[PDB]
Amino acid sequence: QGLMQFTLPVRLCKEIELFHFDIGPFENMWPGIFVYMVHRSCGTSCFELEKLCRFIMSVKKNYRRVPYHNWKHAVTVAHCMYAILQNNHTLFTDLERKGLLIACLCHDLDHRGFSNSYLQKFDHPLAALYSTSTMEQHHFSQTVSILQLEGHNIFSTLSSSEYEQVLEIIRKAIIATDLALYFGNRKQLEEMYQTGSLNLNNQSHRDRVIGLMMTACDLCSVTKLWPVTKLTANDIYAEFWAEGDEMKKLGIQPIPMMDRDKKDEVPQGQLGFYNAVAIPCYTTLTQILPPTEPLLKACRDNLSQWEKVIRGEE
Ligand SMILES: CCc1nc2ccccc2nc1N1CCN(S(=O)(=O)c2ccc(C)cc2)CC1
Ligand SMILES: [Mg+2]
Ligand SMILES: [Zn+2]
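That is the input. Now the predicted structure with magnesium ion docked in place:
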């Protein structure tokens, strides 16, 4: 380094600050987009450039060539966290800023394009090692594996204490991307917000709020402009339909969301998802962190586009 400031072309320099930024189809630019975000979010001092670059490149290598849960999803989820962090400057600790972009880049490490349910029904060894949040315990394990490679300890300057804290932020942040855990977490956050007991000084409360940020970042395809949201849905369903086919091979009728013979039902399925998951998620997140409101707004725009799909207006 250390007078070596990463810079993006003008359109990307400006649009990367917005919630609805799409990182584009140039895979070789995604590392530099991430380093740019870390440097602006955390500092040019938070990591050794050489270590960070070696970390990024091994993380990339440990994402698979699957239609949705790939390297592009990793960096997209990290970008949504960057936009939240940058819009809420003063609310987050030095360790939080360090851990959370890394947790986002690593949150689906070594994903095979299959749900926790499918692993359990297949009887995958990972389902015997990790009885709940199966893939999420695996993603965290792969994150620690990569951090333990020679020349890959991006946290090397931290004390023993701070290193355990940062790895505990990452572990909780990654486990929270289990959507099965989201529903309870958001209910509690909503009760706490409304009875005015929510306290960002209570670590157990910060944990919940970081969990909800992680869901919000993970679901951020619903917060893009319609043509991005619509095209991303295709990749999401390409994975679901493969899992459906694999369910059928075990002699199990999949749920309709995963059945490629039931493609006509996707628009109504999207409606349910925006109503039951996405809108509540961004609504509670906006109550706790008002500057995240553009995510709710974009989500509501996309619900309205799915309503139009159903009404054959598109
Ligand atoms: C409507 C579908 C949907 N659309 C999305 C659109 C945009 C972004 C994210 C999206 N996520 C979606 N999924 C995420 C996965 N879950 S799950 O509950 O973990 C689940 C897992 C396995 C099985 C067998 C049943 C349920 C369901 C919802
Ligand atoms: Mg995941
Ligand atoms: Zn994810």
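The two ends are 51 Å apart (CA to CA).
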